[PDB]
Structure 1
């Protein structure tokens, strides 16, 4: 008998698997209160924080031998090494000034944490770049590179934030330029920039606090606490304040509260807080100035700033009588100071005419002062006052008054130079005192165009009733101011 055949030798197969992991990263951008500000808006000088985060390292990994984060930072973002180090325990921090790049390397300690249990996934830790944004109208973008064991590398998402002062901002549709405005207006609201302004007239300066670009701002509380001020550096050599007439309204036409007003003879007279604010804003007023202050920065911010609601300040200022004696120009300029950041308004210039009445003999001829063309305010008073000896000279009761320039009325009527104007005047005579006042009727003076020059002269008929010398004094009053001689 033959033997059975042995069982066939069988074959088996086996194989191993390969597997690998690419942990994700995420760069976050936050304000100084750790509020997410990606694609929003924060004030110039805001602390901006960059958190360079990494997803969990996987179970079954090899030991991690290096864990490195490299962050090329944005231009205008000022790196803070000490705050960054303080915010980034577990990392060694280094910085390249040439390329504005910060590098974080996990310390041996941090790696030991990552390496403690290779059989389970482990959460990473993250560094935080701390710095400040230094420019108006700027967009600060940022991402970073993670490299693990010099064998795995990945670049993060790009985060950003923008500062106010940039038009066509796709993240912030209300963003535009920060441009405080100053305009000079008369009592009827006509713009009088560049015009002649008579001594005793009021400049109803109008100041715009330009807040619209700040709408939906996401600045931190420390930044907001730097407050909100408005400065009018007024020409104190020419003007006196009528601070009692100040009015502050918002862009919806509502009265503003919580804004106080003060004025100071100079910086040195001002409190320390104001000197500090002005210093930090780079503003040095010349001599005297007026300052408007948000009493409660938080409330002001919530009410007008984050809402983008402009304010309008009316600050009336009167031309001193002395300016009518000297003549001269004066300039006004304002500043808004938001979150400690100053911005200068345009400058507004006006000039004051030197009014020069003259006395002549032909009849005393009292030549009135000239109101130049292109002046800013209605004429309401134009008087001739003559104090005569009466010893002396005897008033007959006859006087006449004439136009000395072509006078244009509000309806385009012209009174030609030389035209008698006596009918538009009255006269008060004190023969015992030896004084006479010739007054133009107010309604007539107010009918004169503010574009028009104005001038008149009086002839006062005198019979001499004595011998010797009789000093004669003639004073011309124009609106609120007297002018001698």
Structure 2
């Protein structure tokens, strides 16, 4: 249009995920196009060519880590391009004046850190790709920061093609990271009204439940759920896991086939459990076969009740960790007294 660099975000499987929720620990497989086709067979002065050929990616450094060894420049046929290098700069102030002047002349402003891809030899780059109208594709994967997941928050990525010193902007690609915040309660039964005893008392030998509410995965998320587990390393000095637990959906779940599993539905059989009575730990994992059936357009959240017994006098704490695609999120810590 006619010189129209583009930027899209993709997941690992190559699905377009522009504007989608992206879980902490996920990778953004950004694809940048270097739009050269309109240049084919044109002639340009040596002087113009000497202004060089660059591609800037003003990536959101506060949120993402570049995965340097996944960054590739290819032509569209997939062939590796040599003669283009890339340099990350933590700021513009810290970049060569050559770079600062280049950007100023293209009227491009960047925020904090960015990447500059460079044609090492503008003459050979010209002859080989520009004159021949051979557009390129830059794969620039960048991974969400795990901590970001405690907070959530928007990030955006922006890019610029710079030919002959003229600058051309891609669209801005926006994503959001969900805040995942698991909760833990203490209850005597599964009744939905049952009293939270967090901060209260439990009798010796009383049977009770630790209720572990998982983090909420929002609709419109960017990739398959592979892992959603509840790991409860409880205090074996005061608590004994009786070997009974149940798992329930917390929301209506929409499957890929279009069916709906309603909120509160017993899904215990779509989970497995590891126990360890010695170190007092239990882990409940959804089966990956089940998780694979959830539509990317569905929210997801579950909760597990662990049947416990109080077996000593004293004050005992409990906290659980919800793992979501292998990132760990800790619940609040509950406390009861016997």
TM over 0.5: yes
**Per-residue displacement from partner, 1:141-178 (whole Å, max 9, x unpaired)?**
xxxxxxxxxxxxxxxxxxxxxxxxxxxxxxxxxxx521
Aligned to 1:347: 172
* Separation in structure 2 between the aligned mates of residue 251 and residue 387 of structure 1, nearest angstrom: 51
Aligned to 1:314: 139
Taking only aligned residues, the RMSD between alpha carbons, in angstroms, comes to: 1.4
2:68 paired with 1:230? no
Q: Which has the higher contact order (CA 8 A, sep 6+)?
A: 2
* Separation in structure 2 between the aligned mates of residue 247 and residue 405 of structure 1, nearest angstrom: 41
The CA deviation at 1:330 is 0.8
**Per-residue displacement from partner, 1:312-367 (whole Å, max 9, x unpaired)?**
11111111112211111111100011111111111111111101110011100000
* Separation in structure 1 between the aligned mates of residue 68 and residue 292 of structure 2, nearest angstrom: 27
Query: Which of 312, 317, 322 is the equivalent residue of 1:466?
Result: 312
Decide which structure has the larger Cα Rg and report it. 1
SS at match of 1:470: strand
Tell whether the 8 Å contact from 1:186 to 1:202 is kept in structure 2 after alignment. Answer: yes
* Separation in structure 1 between the aligned mates of residue 227 and residue 87 of structure 2, nearest angstrom: 33
Aligned to 1:287: 112
2:122 paired with 1:297? yes
2:274 paired with 1:428? yes
SS at match of 2:174: strand
2:60 paired with 1:214? no
Tell whether the 8 Å contact from 1:212 to 1:310 is kept in structure 2 after alignment. Answer: yes
**Per-residue displacement from partner, 1:101-124 (whole Å, max 9, x unpaired)?**
xxxxxxxxxxxxxxxxxxxxxxxx
Aligned to 1:269: 94
Which segments of 5 or more consecutive residues in structure 1 lack a partner in the other structure?
1-175
TM-score, normalised to structure 2, is 0.88
* Separation in structure 1 between the aligned mates of residue 282 and residue 63 of structure 2, nearest angstrom: 32
The CA deviation at 1:430 is 1.8
TM-score, normalised to structure 1, is 0.62
* Separation in structure 1 between the aligned mates of residue 304 and residue 76 of structure 2, nearest angstrom: 51
Aligned to 2:196: none
Tell whether the 8 Å contact from 1:199 to 1:480 is kept in structure 2 after alignment. Answer: no
* Separation in structure 1 between the aligned mates of residue 52 and residue 300 of structure 2, nearest angstrom: 49
Which has the larger displacement, 360-369 or 258-267?
258-267
Tell whether the 8 Å contact from 1:223 to 1:339 is kept in structure 2 after alignment. Answer: yes
2:309 paired with 1:484? no
SS at match of 1:300: helix
Superposed counterparts of 1:439-478, under 5 Å: 439-478=285-324
The CA deviation at 1:419 is 1.6
2:230 paired with 1:384? yes
2:264 paired with 1:418? yes
Which segments of 5 or more consecutive residues in structure 2 lack a partner in the other structure?
188-208, 332-338
* Separation in structure 1 between the aligned mates of residue 227 and residue 19 of structure 2, nearest angstrom: 23
* Separation in structure 2 between the aligned mates of residue 240 and residue 254 of structure 1, nearest angstrom: 26
The CA deviation at 1:272 is 3.4
Superposed counterparts of 1:99-178, under 5 Å: 177-178=2-3
Aligned to 1:32: none
Superposed counterparts of 1:34-49, under 5 Å: none
* Closer, same or farther: CA 289–480 of 1 in aligned 2, 3 Å: farther
* Separation in structure 1 between the aligned mates of residue 328 and residue 60 of structure 2, nearest angstrom: 22
Superposed counterparts of 1:20-59, under 5 Å: none
Query: Which of 390, 395, 400 is the equivalent residue of 2:246?
Result: 400
Query: Which of 321, 324, 327 is the equivalent residue of 2:149?
Result: 324
Aligned to 1:14: none
SS at match of 1:275: helix
- Paired residue total: 310
Superposed counterparts of 1:192-211, under 5 Å: 192-211=17-36
Tell whether the 8 Å contact from 1:201 to 1:480 is kept in structure 2 after alignment. Answer: no
* Separation in structure 2 between the aligned mates of residue 289 and residue 360 of structure 1, nearest angstrom: 44
The CA deviation at 1:411 is 2.1
The CA deviation at 1:267 is 1.4
